[PDB]
Amino acid sequence: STIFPFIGVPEDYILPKTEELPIFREVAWDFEKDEPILEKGDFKIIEKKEALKVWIYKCIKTNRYEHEIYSLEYGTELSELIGQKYTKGLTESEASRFIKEALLINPYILEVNVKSANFNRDILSANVKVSTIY
Amino acid sequence: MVYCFKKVNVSLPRTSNQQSKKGKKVEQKNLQAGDLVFFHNPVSHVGLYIGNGEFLHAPQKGDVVKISKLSSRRDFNTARRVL
Amino acid sequence: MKLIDKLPSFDRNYIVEEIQGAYDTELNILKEDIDDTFNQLFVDTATWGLDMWEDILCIEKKELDFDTRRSNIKAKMRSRGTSTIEVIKSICEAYTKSETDIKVYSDEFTFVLSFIANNCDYKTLLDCSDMIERVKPAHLLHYLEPII
Amino acid sequence: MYSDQTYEVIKNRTLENINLDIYKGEGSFLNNMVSGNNLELSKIYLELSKMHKMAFIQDTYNQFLDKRVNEFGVYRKLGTESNGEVEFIGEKGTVINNGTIISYRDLLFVVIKDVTIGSEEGDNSPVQALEVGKKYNLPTNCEFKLVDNISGVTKITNTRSFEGGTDIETDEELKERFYKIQRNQATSGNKAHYEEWALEVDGVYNVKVYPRWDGPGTVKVLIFGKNNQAVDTETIERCQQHIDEEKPIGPTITVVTPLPIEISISAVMKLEDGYTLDNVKESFLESINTYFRDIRGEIIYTKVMGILINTTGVHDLSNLLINGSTDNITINEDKIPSVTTVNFSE
Amino acid sequence: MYSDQTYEVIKNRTLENINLDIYKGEGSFLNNMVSGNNLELSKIYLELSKMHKMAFIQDTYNQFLDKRVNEFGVYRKLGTESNGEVEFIGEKGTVINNGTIISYRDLLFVVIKDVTIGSEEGDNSPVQALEVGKKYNLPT
Amino acid sequence: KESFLESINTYFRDIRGEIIYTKVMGILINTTGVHDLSNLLINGSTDNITINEDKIPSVTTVNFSE
Numbered sequence A: 001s002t003i004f005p006f007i008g009v010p011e012d013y014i015l016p017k018t019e020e021l022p023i024f025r026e027v028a029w030d031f032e033k034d035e036p037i038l039e040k041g042d043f044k045i046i047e048k049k050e051a052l053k054v055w056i057y058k059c060i061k062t063n064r065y066e067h068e069i070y071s072l073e074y075g076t077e078l079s080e081l082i083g084q085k086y087t088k089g090l091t092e093s094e095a096s097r098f099i100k101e102a103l104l105i106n107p108y109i110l111e112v113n114v115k116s117a118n119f120n121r122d123i124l125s126a127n128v129k130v131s132t133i134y
Numbered sequence B: 001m002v003y004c005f006k007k008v009n010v011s012l013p014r015t016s017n018q019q020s021k022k023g024k025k026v027e028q029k030n031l032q033a034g035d036l037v038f039f040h041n042p043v044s045h046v047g048l049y050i051g052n053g054e055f056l057h058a059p060q061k062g063d064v065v066k067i068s069k070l071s072s073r074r075d076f077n078t079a080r081r082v083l
Numbered sequence C: 001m002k003l004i005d006k007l008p009s010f011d012r013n014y015i016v017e018e019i020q021g022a023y024d025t026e027l028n029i030l031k032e033d034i035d036d037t038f039n040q041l042f043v044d045t046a047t048w049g050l051d052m053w054e055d056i057l058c059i060e061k062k063e064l065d066f067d068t069r070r071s072n073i074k075a076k077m078r079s080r081g082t083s084t085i086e087v088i089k090s091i092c093e094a095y096t097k098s099e100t101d102i103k104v105y106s107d108e109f110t111f112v113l114s115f116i117a118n119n120c121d122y123k124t125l126l127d128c129s130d131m132i133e134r135v136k137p138a139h140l141l142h143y144l145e146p147i148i
Numbered sequence D: 001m002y003s004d005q006t007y008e009v010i011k012n013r014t015l016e017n018i019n020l021d022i023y024k025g026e027g028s029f030l031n032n033m034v035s036g037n038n039l040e041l042s043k044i045y046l047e048l049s050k051m052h053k054m055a056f057i058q059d060t061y062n063q064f065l066d067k068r069v070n071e072f073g074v075y076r077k078l079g080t081e082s083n084g085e086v087e088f089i090g091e092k093g094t095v096i097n098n099g100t101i102i103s104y105r106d107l108l109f110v111v112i113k114d115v116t117i118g119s120e121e122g123d124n125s126p127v128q129a130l131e132v133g134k135k136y137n138l139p140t141n142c143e144f145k146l147v148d149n150i151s152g153v154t155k156i157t158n159t160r161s162f163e164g165g166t167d168i169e170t171d172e173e174l175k176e177r178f179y180k181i182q183r184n185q186a187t188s189g190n191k192a193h194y195e196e197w198a199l200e201v202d203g204v205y206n207v208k209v210y211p212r213w214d215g216p217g218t219v220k221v222l223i224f225g226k227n228n229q230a231v232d233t234e235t236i237e238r239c240q241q242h243i244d245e246e247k248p249i250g251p252t253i254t255v256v257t258p259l260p261i262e263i264s265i266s267a268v269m270k271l272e273d274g275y276t277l278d279n280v281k282e283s284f285l286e287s288i289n290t291y292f293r294d295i296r297g298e299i300i301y302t303k304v305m306g307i308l309i310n311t312t313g314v315h316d317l318s319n320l321l322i323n324g325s326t327d328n329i330t331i332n333e334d335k336i337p338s339v340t341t342v343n344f345s346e
Numbered sequence E: 001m002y003s004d005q006t007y008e009v010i011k012n013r014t015l016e017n018i019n020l021d022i023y024k025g026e027g028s029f030l031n032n033m034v035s036g037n038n039l040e041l042s043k044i045y046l047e048l049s050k051m052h053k054m055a056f057i058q059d060t061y062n063q064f065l066d067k068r069v070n071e072f073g074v075y076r077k078l079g080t081e082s083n084g085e086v087e088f089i090g091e092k093g094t095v096i097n098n099g100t101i102i103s104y105r106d107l108l109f110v111v112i113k114d115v116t117i118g119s120e121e122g123d124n125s126p127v128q129a130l131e132v133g134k135k136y137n138l139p140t
Numbered sequence F: 001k002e003s004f005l006e007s008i009n010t011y012f013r014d015i016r017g018e019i020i021y022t023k024v025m026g027i028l029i030n031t032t033g034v035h036d037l038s039n040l041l042i043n044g045s046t047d048n049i050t051i052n053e054d055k056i057p058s059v060t061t062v063n064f065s066e
Helices: A047-062 A088-103 B001-008 C014-039 C051-057 C066-078 C085-098 C122-137 D007-017 D028-056 D065-072 D171-184 D189-200 D233-248 D277-294 D301-310 E006-019 E029-034 E040-055 E065-074 F002-014 F021-030
Strands: A024-028 A046-048 A109-120 A123-130 B025-027 B034-036 B048-051 B054-057 B066-067 B078-081 C100-107 C109-113 C141-146 D081-090 D102-103 D109-113 D124-132 D153-157 D206-211 D219-225 D252-256 D260-271 D314-322 D338-346 E083-087 E100-105 E107-111 E124-129
Touching: A024 A047, A046 A047, A047 A088, A047 A123, A088 A123, B001 D102, C014 D007, C014 D028, C014 D171, C014 E040, C014 E100, C051 C066, C066 C085, C066 E065, C085 C109, C085 C122, C122 C141, D007 D028, D028 E006, D028 E029, D028 E040, D065 D171, D102 E083, D153 E029, D189 D219, D189 D233, D219 D233, D233 D252, D260 D277, D260 D301, D277 D301, D277 D338, D301 D314, D301 F021, D314 F021, E006 E029, E006 E040, E083 E107, F002 F021
Parallel strands: C109 C141, D219 D252, D260 D338
Antiparallel strands: A024 A046, A109 A123, B025 B078, B034 B048, B034 B078, B048 B054, B054 B066, C100 C109, D081 D124, D081 D153, D102 D109, D109 D124, D206 D219, D260 D314, E083 E124, E100 E107, E107 E124
């Protein structure tokens, strides 16, 4: 009977209550052998920071623009630094930036710091601190 | 001519007066086969010019479709081409 | 061995390999089905889609061989419209699978089809003759002259 | 093939293709993921089925019927414009030029003749609708308003209803016509062409064609009247001239008429609820005429019994007499049975 | 609608259909497993779109158009090579046999009939183009 | 025999109440291949057969002689 003078239908104007992010859960992973972990004949699900460890490991391990399935923001660019394409200081600064920007897309991660950086032989070492909501 | 030009996918106005207002103007010396000829100021009947000073038309009630000589029609007004 | 190449190099474990191989086989099956469905569109290639032309050409009959149904479809779709000497002779060519020559005798009002019936069955030739009878002019007389 | 692959089958095949020690079943990780993928997998098969159905225009107005009938030569009809004539009432000497536009409510019309009021030619001028559609089939005694004002006119009306306005050919009618034309076999000079040319003519309800009856180049046309009766001489003449106009150059056409056989039919029957004796009689007349045209030899009592009993409206029959007997009546040459009387008792 | 169906839409719908508790987002195990064959489905939809276009008679390209018309019996018309006559001028008695090829520009032609220069029958012999085409209709 | 059994099975499916003799010979004559018939007998008689409640007739024996 009565007209609806707005675009759409009354159903589209119901807003679900905004709540905290649901608890982060992920399939367990074995870093030494690079395999998912089975428990009692099924996949094993871990919670909170362990799942975050799995996600961070997987994110760091991939290259940024190599795969079609991923968007342009997923992955890291650490492969461009191999072979000393830049000076040592430029490589250090770029590595810090790459790690920070790659990791920060996850809404469960609040801040990232790359603190220690040392060149010994052909190896580059660094320390990374990640702060989450947990 | 409505029927004849509909047979070649040429749509023309139903009444010949409006038919005079379609297509490029044609002169009496530039008349060729297939042209349309209009004579009186009211176009009671329009002819289809076939060349050689002859043209086909339906004259009026009581007459039948036949071939007329153009010169016998002193009343020539204008001509059009739609093909 | 194809879907797994789209993933990073830490996904090479046997579990992921099995999971991706299953979908590899499924995609292969789907592509094969799509190709078969496309092949079913054309008259010559279609086998299980042949019956769906019968609904559009009002054939309404049962036959055992796909080739015979294809030939009847070609006939129904050829004999429509114009019925002249050359087109009728070409339809008889399509049925008999050989070149046909029509000799007309105006004084006798009789035409004869000369052709090759090496690969044409006499019953198939008779079916073609009956169809030609129902397309040919009634007054004219027809004779079949198969030259094996 | 697309119908063969269903949701359950593909889901089972995908589950079985995974050779792993983990469990597959209700509320399992692999089972849920597999089902979620297979829904989208089977969507494609369903769409392929719909695509194939649309391609061969089976049902539900697939937009490809137009292209298929353009392939087969069929064309849709946009309708024909309504035609009529109106009367101009006004001052004498006022001339209405050819092409003058008038309107009837939302409808609009154009004058076809140069008409002058009060003239010896009268004040009536033919008028044609500008657009197709049955909406332009105007009734009688309608008032027409001029879009463009002309001095001297007062009232414009038509003495009788406009006719000829028809709508665009709807798609269902197009499909039906395509089916009927596909059932027909129309080819140059064939027996079916003779049949068609004969049935166009009035006074002919049934056609039989006899090729080469008098040697080559002779066609014998056997036509039948209503209720399989003889065709009159004038009707035979018009049929002959029509076929001659439509016959190929060279053939000669000969037409003969059948000779009737008077038959008395009588039966006792029980009617179903909602039917009358007149409906039974007319349906029986049609069915028995249909049986008459196809029969050769002798009329058969039991075929007549079956045709009568199959008639809609008859729940039972009893006491069936053909010419006062239950025996076969021999039909001789140049003779056709012709129903004469229908004595039915309920 | 096939154009509207894209990799992102298919992936989003598939993930929404799955009823699991774990996190579904870029870089997750479930997302990695699901992605990869949805891209293939998005690929397949375009071929599905093109198929109905190549099915009809109005737009059938070249080969399938040939199949459809051959179903109707109409055959494509091939060209016929041009025919002409040239004159040979030279010493009397030189014999030009059939199958001899003459050339103008880059086009090639064959002499049909045996002709002798200075013979009574004349020095003009028929000339036939080796290939079909309107380009072989040389002027005088 | 097979065509008549098919037609009579459809009939026996659709018929409520007692059986009809004239419909029986009608469905028999319409059965393809029958040029004429005579002496049509149902259960030893030409009478209408009454069907009681919770009862559906079935064809048991068909004795056709040319």
